[PDB]
DNA sequence: TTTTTTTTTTTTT
């Protein structure tokens, strides 16, 4: 047989020194728990430790042994000789810590192992199972066995070092000459005073009613960027197929109404203009359209890694939009289901250090009000997309609703929330044929 | 004991295949490699089949035995038996796509097995190697496995691919002086100005109040789109029988009033017309009706795919209407089978590139509105029929509500929903009586 | 053999700090009496007080032992070792407050426990008693125990109080304002009014929909906690990393738009303030901040407990927030797993005798009625959170629902829910600005 | 034990033809579904050919083989 | 047990 690694030595000392003394119990928590035992009766004496810890009795040779035969344990444990010979074989918890790492590694060790053995098991009885569940299951079991040494060494501790490195990076800031702009620069000068560009590490949400202009301002603010700066960004078009995103790019560049583009009725001039922006789009080479349809959270997880890895890093990553992702496991209860998207997205702009902007759509509730310009509340389905996201914008055109209003071709982008900074309306211009926002150079109108 | 997985079989008919057709060398090589097999003797055939094909010999029998026997290899690999039987076993060549395709499989397997027990004996024995590079080789290695795939599941795209493909579009859509018309011949001019046709792939509607003509109209579409092209059209009634439509049909196309159809009050003269209008439907012979009742949407696809089949595919499909459908899985809630019901339609018009026109019904509350114009957001049950549509078309006959409009017998198409093209409005003369929607000669009114 | 509840390190300590402190043996009298212990002994030991306070002769060990030596009762209670004992078994005659409330409580639970005896004794044996009679006897006993308990809130004031409380704040009034707080000081004069500050052992929490200041209030109330004491607080921030949190707090202290500091685009002036808040931070040192994500009860209450015995206590801890803390035991039934989360944050509040600040969310059904200011009704997944809760508070903003009301920059503090003490709305300034909030010193308008 | 009615004959001629030829699923998928047949195993074997059919993939003995074996 | 989206009827301001 292949016996597991496993050193019982370093848990029997743990054993007896949290017998000995128990306020060195902290140590045996921090770096092990009850299951990180080789021998089953460690993991019970462990568990009974922690429930009289928690019970506020002390932990010795009497109160485990009165709690193990109240429970019935002491006789699985082996008895309160055991224990006794624990504590004998125990000199003193002065290297209690040592023990507990040599048991969490062991513990790891035996993690790894089992691991090992399922996916040996799964290539030798897939059961009908195909190539790509094996691999995301490699790939979560990766990032599982990887998440005990994420952050596992230190919990609260110290405020001074928050206040080093909280002044350092207002210095850096403060030395670096830059026009107000932090994160990536959106492309519209109103638009940068309020949200000081895209900002790294933040779950940006579009919102808006069918064909009001989600996927046209999304697309907008990629090709600034991409324009802008030098790292690549990532598209995720679940809905559109990647030669209708391009059209529609390829008119918003150039200029050219989209109607042409898409029935190929373009003259001499829209030829030399089309040809002007491939040459400048074919210049730079920044920018990646997945158009899969129904991409788990772990997919999109998979594929924007690779993307940083071969080109060391991302400069924004867009969803199209968030209803459209799946997730199998909560396929019955809707509501978990997209709770669960928005939680992974959040942390996926964390990990990668890259603006995330996901798009949504809105209730019908909206629609039978007065008023029509939209709120937080009205995001479909949105269990949780209001409470996570750092900023959400909302795309209005009034001319939409009322055939005689005043502002005719014109968007107001509502700020409806943002954690670190203020919330107001900006307006914009919009050429549908075009398929693009445009600054709105005109009159401004102040914002209540 | 556990056998490797393999299929020698296969091995044996991706060998046999290519002997004797030698033109589906390059799907087999850029599919299977020699490594792929588990058999070493068959990777010596393939490597000597490989090196033939770079020499410019033919793929043969012969030519494989002299190469085999010059280098000695024919011993090990067997010798005219064993080759002649090589090929005895292979069902057919056409097939060989299959085979090969299994091949790559039975490797990838193997390949993970590989893996899986190269991560096992890594775990096991550390060999000097701490926790953390552990990881790493599994990361590793699960990456190699991914990146080992080819693609084969349509990853993140570079951008200088996406424009070679859209501009090769709109230069071949130049080439082709069709002057508007890119899709589907709808049959009224000013109807094609805006929707510019009925484009494949799309999700198009036709939404109205009962009896305002919702059958009426795609039955008139049905009937333009197949006297103006020569693909099968395929109609799915689910509301009414098939006489009853083909009733409708004849009062349209020969102009006769359907009530003396119906009641069979007919002259001498509408015989005349009626005959008229047969031979040219018979001639033609490329309209399909399924009258059956409650299909899902398993059956709508499987049917649709038969006739695309079977007569060298299809030029569009009608459906009567979105929410007599049923997905006898999802019955408890309404909501969630309609969006799964739009979702299919959706996808079908995909797969087969082909436009499908899905009726659908409309709400009672805009019957409490002082204007009785539909919008967007009246859709029954409609969670994501405004999302997923490409194109939504709204009938409203405003003589039905004020008697004294001076719009008698003027239907309007109120395009609610268009999302590469504009909106608005398109006047047609109603005539009941046949049956029939016609152009609106008169003035024109411009559109707000 | 169902032992009757009882606590003897109370009676212990209570006995013993009576015995060191004097004048407060009135309040503990008050609170509890000689027949409110367990142990006849100790009973006697307090009648032996309450007889010398009768008398007026000082109370401690020299004059307990003469009066029990005189009484014959020396010997009784175990001589003068055991009065010796009894003191030393108190720490200090301060927190005799709690221990005199746990030997209420047992007391409350003794005579409960006697009540329900007396009743099943009635009922096995009626003697000829009728039902009426044995209601009646029940209906008076449960009258007793409810209305044996003194307390406050416990009725409708008569008339004779209210007079004099009437003529007795009208003189003050007219002379002096006369303001007590008397309570763990959060910061602000008009909540100490209505909470009598913050009061260990309590769970508290803080609900308001996403963006209302629900962080910004709660990280308030940590700062002032922090310079008017000397116990270490700790934060739990499960969403915001300590860089984002350690901002809001510089621009809070120092005044400074956060703005600003976030953009990097200080000046002389504003540096000059925020290292003046870095000196006073840094000499107290009394802050930890862990923003580890995803906890668990077991972990929080492990690093509670150990930053406690290393500085000896905590004098508060803040959570942010409660839905985010996870119970992988229960992760199936959402409800549940709240109703453990909220159980575990009680049971460590009381175990340390700590306040405990939760943070919370809150439904959408707010959102739909006319009146959109929170009830206790609406926090989300309420299994039992509202139960739990000591003390609630909402934070309400009528601006955001209406741009013209008149309380701009105005907020209310709702208190849903109170051990002690009346429910009542106190308003405050929101100087979004600063991250702040700060005292409503404008006209007070009288709350209805 | 009364012998339930069954016809193996008519099972295994269309099993069979199936295997030779895939131009005629569909005759036979309106007609028959997998729980017409008697014995398990003619049943494991159509829905492995379902199956297959559905994903647009020929039919013969080495494809049925691996899938079947697939499964187990 | 909780959160979500769709229908239809009543009562009030
Ligand atoms: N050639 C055109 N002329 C005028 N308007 C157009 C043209 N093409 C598209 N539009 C408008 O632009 C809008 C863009 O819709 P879309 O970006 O799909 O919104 P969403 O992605 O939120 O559904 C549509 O409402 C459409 O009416
Ligand atoms: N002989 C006729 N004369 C006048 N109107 C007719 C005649 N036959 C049918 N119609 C009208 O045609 C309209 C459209 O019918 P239909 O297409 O079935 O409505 P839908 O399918 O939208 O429910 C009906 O409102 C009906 O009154
Ligand atoms: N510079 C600023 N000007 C105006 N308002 C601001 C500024 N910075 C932050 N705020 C406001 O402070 C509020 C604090 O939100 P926050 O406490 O994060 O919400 P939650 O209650 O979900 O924790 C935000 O709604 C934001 O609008
Ligand atoms: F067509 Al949409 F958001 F309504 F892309
Ligand atoms: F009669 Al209908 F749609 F209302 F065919
Ligand atoms: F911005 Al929040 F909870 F909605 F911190
Ligand atoms: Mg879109
Ligand atoms: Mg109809
Ligand atoms: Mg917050």
Redesign the pocket.
Known sequence: LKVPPHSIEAEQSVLGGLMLDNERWDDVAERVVADDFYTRPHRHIFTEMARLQESGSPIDLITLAESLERQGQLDSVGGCAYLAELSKNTPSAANISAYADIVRERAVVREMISVANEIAEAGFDPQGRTSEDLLDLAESRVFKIAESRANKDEGPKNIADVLDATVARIEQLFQQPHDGVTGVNTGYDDLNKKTAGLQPSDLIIVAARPSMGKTTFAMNLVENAAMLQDKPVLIFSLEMPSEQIMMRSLASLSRVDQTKIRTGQLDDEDWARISGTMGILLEKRNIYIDDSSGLTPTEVRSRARRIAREHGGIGLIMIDYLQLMRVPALSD???LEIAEISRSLKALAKELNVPVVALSQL???LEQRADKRPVNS???????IEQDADLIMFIYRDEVYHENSDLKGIAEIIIGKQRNGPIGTVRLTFNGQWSRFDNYAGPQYDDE
Do not use: A, C, V
């Open positions: 209860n809707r509501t209730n019908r509730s009205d995001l479909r389905e949105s269990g949780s």
